[PDB]
Point group: C2
């Protein structure tokens, strides 16, 4: 989670958002999901009213 | 056009069907439509409610 502000001073954003977010638990992040780039073809002759 | 009967004597089928089919005109037949066997793949992941 990342909180990002534009037009706010950094000491204002810590007087508000720090007492409301500090007690979420520290957990290990998971492993990032994997995939591989194969090739591929795809085609769909369109829905039967289009033409 | 071919008329085909099963259980009828051949001289009965000519007393009925001949005075009604003899005056169609004699025309040349057309050329028979052509195609070639290529290969091919096809796939359709099924309609979205079937699984």
């Amino acid at each position: 989670i990342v909180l990002a502000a534009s037009g706010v001073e950094h000491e204002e954003l810590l007087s508000i958002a720090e007492p409301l977010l500090s007690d979420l638990p520290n957990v290990p992040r998971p492993e990032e999901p994997k995939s591989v780039y194969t090739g591929g073809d795809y085609r769909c002759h369109t829905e039967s009213g289009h033409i």
